[PDB]
């Protein structure tokens, strides 16, 4: 249901059609955000799962303060689907020190 950085590498057992909410700290003032490979918020495969994403600025409204990206992942097919995100500047792409997040959605 509700997935955070704490769940990195975890498998969630879900139904096809079930929405999985992933919440990750994200600070757009860094230029970094969470992306699928290629630097998009779009699902790598719409047939496998659908992804919606929203940034929530911090309640504090403090300048430079990080907020939270929420990804709503809806599994569309049975199987174990890797939701593979990387915290990167989309103009830079990933590197060996990029923060990464993965959750597996074991779907039926």
Swiss-Prot record:
A UniProt-annotated Pfam family: Inhibitor_I42
Principal place of residence: other
GO cellular component entries: cell surface; ciliary pocket; cytoplasmic vesicle
Protein encoded by which gene: cha
Oligomeric form and interacting partners: Interacts with cruzipain.
Designated name of the protein: Chagasin
Organism name: Trypanosoma cruzi
Family from the record: Belongs to the protease inhibitor I42 family.
Motif DE loop positions after renumbering to this chain: 57-66
Compartment list: Flagellar pocket; Cytoplasmic vesicle; Cell surface
